[PDB]
Symmetry: C3
Subunit: 189 residues, 3 copies
């Protein structure tokens, strides 16, 4: 199974940061055996975070992908599942996938939050944190935090959360339009 689960090529806004349809998430997940190879980028098109500066607060927001136990996207997700499907060479434009457990983050590697020091649960392991760059400009750093299975909303079985933000002080407003970020994670199966 070398398939890809992705945000579909429809050019419409597909995601909610603050309100419905205010952003365009690009996400591709490709199965490489027991690891998923991923690339993600975000463009906020309208609303509070479309153009940012130091007077905007807070300087972080969250995009949640919540999945049930078959790996299907739940309607409480920030991503509109209208735009979430397997990439295909055929015409699955109108056929939603039924199962994608092999694309879910492992709940053994990344367990949901729930005395021996050797039994201490890692707080870092379920997160991937890096700079991204607004407009792809080296002098416009922001950040991305990818989180695995840290959500409980909608009785989800699995979750992938993207927290986007920034810390550098910006006087002139700049679009929140991120460079693409590559990451990988251990798959459920």
């Amino acid at each position: 199974d070398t398939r890809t689960l992705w945000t579909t090529p429809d050019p419409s806004p597909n995601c909610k940061v603050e309100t419905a349809r205010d952003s365009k998430l690009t996400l591709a997940l490709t199965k490489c055996g027991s690891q998923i190879l991923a690339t993600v980028s975000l463009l906020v098109v309208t609303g509070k975070y479309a153009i940012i500066s130091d007077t905007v607060n807070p300087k972080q927001f969250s995009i949640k992908l919540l999945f049930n136990d078959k790996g299907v996207l739940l309607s409480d997700s920030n991503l509109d599942g209208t735009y979430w499907n397997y990439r295909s060479n055929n015409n699955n434009i109108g056929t939603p996938y039924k199962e994608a457990v092999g694309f879910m983050p492992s709940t053994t590697a990344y367990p949901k939050p729930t005395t021996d020091p050797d039994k201490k649960v890692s707080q870092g392991k379920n997160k991937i944190v890096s700079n991204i760059y607004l407009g792809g400009e080296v002098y416009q750093p922001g950040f991305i935090v990818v989180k695995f299975n840290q959500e409980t909303d909608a009785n989800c079985a699995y979750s992938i959360t993207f927290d986007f933000g920034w810390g550098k002080v910006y006087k002139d407003p700049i679009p929140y339009d991120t460079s693409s970020f590559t990451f990988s994670y251990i798959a459920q199966e």
Copy 2:
């Protein structure tokens, strides 16, 4: 198709930073279905950018890989095509499966019709000599070139911002990235 398209892993000088073949670009592209997994590193061997310090300007340069509509490297590229080929000296005829998607990364009123300028770039620190106190940067850009009537392009911008009074070689740590494939 799980093949690799690369420079070979230990290339002779094959790339132009300032003058032809003044550097060694090691680049491997591995097809994982419709996403490409890539690793890149650059050693400048001669000329202006072989040994850098704060007196060198400008502190950024561009390496363009330009492809036709079959995914074949055009001779106007900074990278020499002589040993750019599949891992296996007959030149390849087709590599469209390794090109960056022009739907995901297209060439350059309604806010819902706004186009992302960030998504076709990957920006990160790299570290000269692999030392944590010698940061530089890399910018990978997909399909942003139009030279030589290219159908696809991958551009690497390398540079640095930190002040280096004691000179050091422009010799990058390896950088991993991925991108959505054309097919």
Copy 3:
């Protein structure tokens, strides 16, 4: 397309300061000529379990040493008991070793040897907090210990001043490298 790993939820399996004082989670997945990797470290006891600006040095090394069949040597910081293919200890994993052509063991300007290409360097973030950067350095084939044929070394550290002590508990880090075969 197989995976070689520590298992995804390992018990203490790694030596930072003393044996089994830390939990290294490492998965290597073969994608043809490249290996795709994810790594994270939790130090659970000892000097580096809870770090601060008084701790020195602010860097330590975790060495994975392999013989010519890609089998982990006992001199490695990582214990080999649960280092195996995902589902008997494995007999061969040369396909998971970093290339000695891309990343030669240490030994005319057009014949200068790159010092950077065998290293991958990035920030990781302790507890996954954006305000707690540390760093990771991955090094290929740079060790000579135990007459190893291949090596992967992880140097972890930090530079930011932390006056309030915090666990050395890294965010996950993804990298890739050219495989030996």
